[PDB]
Each structure stands twice: as structure tokens, then as C-alpha cells.
């Protein structure tokens, strides 16, 4: 009886929420042929209660998510037909506009669905920090990804310029003190360079011991801060070969940072008002903007 076969397959799926394989189905019901089992599986997939997964072990048939219900008012059809892509998004989340365009349902209907799911605690709405336009909905069980929301720098969808500046200043002061100690040691050039070199893990532990903010700062966060300092033109990083040590971050490679003085002092162009003039393009001998009656050079000479 195909109805009995489908019922037994549904019972096996209930017993194994993670899915069942054709081998398990055959072991449970060996007196039925593979053709009948395949016909039953096809009917189940056509009526829409089972889902197919392709794992390294083969094929898995899992019961569709129906027991987990957050919107029972109305019909579970739209509930699951929204929870599908809600789960598909998961960590990356999805905006309400995208949910509406993917569901092809009215704004009021989708809002009611989302409100019922949030009231029954199946989805959480978090403000997208990348683009603060709408609130993305994610699964209540999944951990919020750092790229789409959160972050050690962002606090309530607000960048902490003061925090990053304090981090940069503290790191630069530490590196400068380390380089000064290395230069004062004057034991040997190589030893001085190795001592001026500062490891990412070392500076991270130093920042942790300082404890400027309450949010935990990661080694990659400190590495990004040091990269920003490098881009600022104040420190230099070198990649040395070390199999394993106290860092163990990168496979075989270790990044060492050291505060370095600039290449050359400020040039001569910047010392003249002409080089720092914003309307320099409109300069002319005879006209409104003339060097004879200039205000920039006048004030620069008066100072």
C-alpha cells in the first residue's frame, strides 16, 4: 500500500530529524522493492513534505520544517514559505524589501508574518550596520555575523572614531617605546631590530592588559589597527618564517611590527601658502585672485 509506505517513511523521518537514507529505509522495510520505495519517495517529494539533501554519504530525505511554528494564525503555508528563505539567509540576514520581493506577498501580510514570528520567538530583527536603512531578520538560534551587524568598532550602529583613535595612539606609543628601548640597548644591530619588532599577539595582549574599552578586542582587530597605522605611514611590518610559537595564528608565518621614522621631513612646497591653496587653479597675474593682493600669503607673512 503506497499510503502505508508513505506513512512509514514519515514515521522514520520523525524518528530521525537529521534525515534517513535509502539503506536505512530498506533495513526498516526490507520486504518492499526499491521501485516501490522510489515511487513513494517521488510522491512524497511531489506533495511537498520531504526535502532532499546531498551529503558525502549519499542522499538524505528530511521531513520539512513544520513542527517549529511561530505563525499559527491563518495558515502554516505562508509561515513555512517565508521561514524557508529566512533560514536560507540566516547569518547574513535579509532586508524586509528583499523578503517582500522574494515572497511576492503584500507588505501588510509579510509584516503580520514577521510580527507573529517575533512574538513566538523564531526570528530576531537587527539593524544592519553596513546600511542603516531597514532591519534584517535572522534566526533566533544563529549567532549574528560580524560583517552584517555588530563589530568591535560599531556600537549601536555608530562608528567609534574616538575609540579607534585611542587604539592607534596607544599602539603607536607602545611601538615607539619598544623601538627606543631597542635603540638604547645598542647590543647588536640584529638584536636591536628583533627587539624593536613587535608581534601581533604581543601588542594584542598589551592592549588587553590596558583594557581601554569593555568590548573584547581580537587579534585580527589589533592586526587591522596595526595595518591602519602602517597606512598612516608610522610603522613597518615584516613577515618572518616561524613554524609554531606563542602566536600560532598564521601557518608558518609571523607578522612583526616596529615604529619607524618618516622617510624625509616635510617638503618645501608645503611650507608656502601657494602649495596648500585650495583655489590654486584660479591663480592669475591680473585679476581678482592675484599674488599681489593675496590673503593667504599676507597672513602667512604677518604671522
Amino acid at each position: 500500500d503506497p499510503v502505508e509506505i508513505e506513512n512509514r517513511i514519515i514515521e522514520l523521518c520523525h524518528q530521525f530529524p537529521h534525515g534517513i537514507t535509502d539503506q536505512v529505509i530498506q533495513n526498516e522495510m526490507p520486504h518492499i522493492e526499491a521501485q516501490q520505495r522510489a515511487v513513494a519517495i517521488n510522491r512524497l517529494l511531489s506533495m511537498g513534505q520531504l526535502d532532499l539533501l546531498r551529503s558525502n554519504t549519499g542522499l538524505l530525505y528530511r521531513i520539512k520544517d513544520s513542527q517549529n511554528a511561530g505563525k499559527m494564525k491563518g495558515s502554516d503555508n505562508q509561515e513555512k514559505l517565508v521561514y524557508q528563505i529566512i533560514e536560507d539567509a540566516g547569518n547574513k540576514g535579509i532586508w524586509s524589501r528583499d523578503i517582500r520581493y522574494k515572497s511576492n506577498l503584500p507588505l501588510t501580510e509579510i509584516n503580520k508574518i514577521l510580527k507573529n514570528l517575533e512574538s513566538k520567538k523564531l526570528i530576531k530583527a537587527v539593524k544592519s550596520v553596513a546600511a542603516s536603512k531597514k532591519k534584517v531578520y535572522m534566526l533566533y538560534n544563529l549567532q549574528p555575523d560580524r560583517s552584517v551587524t555588530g563589530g568591535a568598532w560599531y556600537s549601536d550602529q555608530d562608528f567609534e572614531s574616538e575609540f579607534v583613535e585611542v587604539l592607534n595612539q596607544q599602539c603607536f606609543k607602545f611601538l615607539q617605546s619598544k623601538a627606543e628601548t631597542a635603540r638604547e640597548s645598542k647590543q647588536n644591530p640584529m638584536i636591536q631590530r628583533n627587539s624593536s619588532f613587535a608581534s601581533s599577539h604581543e601588542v594584542w595582549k598589551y592592549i588587553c592588559e590596558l583594557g581601554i574599552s569593555k568590548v573584547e578586542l581580537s587579534m585580527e582587530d589589533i592586526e587591522t589597527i596595526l595595518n591602519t597605522l602602517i597606512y598612516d605611514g608610522k610603522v613597518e611590518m615584516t613577515i618572518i618564517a616561524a613554524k609554531e610559537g606563542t602566536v600560532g595564528s598564521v601557518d608558518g608565518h609571523m607578522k612583526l611590527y616596529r615604529a619607524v621614522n618618516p622617510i624625509i621631513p616635510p617638503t618645501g612646497l608645503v611650507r608656502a601658502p601657494c602649495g596648500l591653496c585650495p583655489v590654486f587653479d584660479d591663480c592669475h597675474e591680473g585679476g581678482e585672485i592675484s599674488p599681489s593682493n593675496c590673503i593667504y600669503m599676507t597672513e602667512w607673512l604677518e604671522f
Binding site: 526535502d51 539533501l53 546531498r54 551529503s55 558525502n56 514559505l81 524557508q84 528563505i85 536560507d88 522574494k102 515572497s103 511576492n104 506577498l105
Partner: protein, 51 residues
């Protein structure tokens, strides 16, 4: 050609290409789009093959 592209290398390591659950929505199709699907050649061919 697909088999050649796959065997481009002598020994093909076990690919971790597990089929993520890409179950798309059975979105409610508008009347115009449903009529277009019904009038499409693929639908008629499938209906003829069903027999």
C-alpha cells in the same frame, strides 16, 4: 566536455561540494505569468510526454 573539465587533473581530490539546501520559494505566480507558463512550449511538451 564536463567529464574532461572534471578530470583535467590526474587525481581529483574529494570535493566538498555538499548541496546546500537551495529550496526556492513556490512563490504565488501572478495570473499573467501563470498564463505565460501554461502557453510556453516546455509546458505543452511536458503535457504531451506525460501520456
Amino acid at each position: 566536455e564536463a567529464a574532461n573539465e572534471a578530470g583535467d587533473s590526474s587525481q581529483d581530490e574529494a570535493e566538498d561540494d555538499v548541496k546546500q539546501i537551495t529550496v526556492r520559494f513556490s512563490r504565488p505566480e501572478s495570473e499573467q505569468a501563470r498564463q505565460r507558463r501554461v502557453q510556453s512550449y516546455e509546458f505543452l511538451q511536458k503535457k504531451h510526454a506525460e501520456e
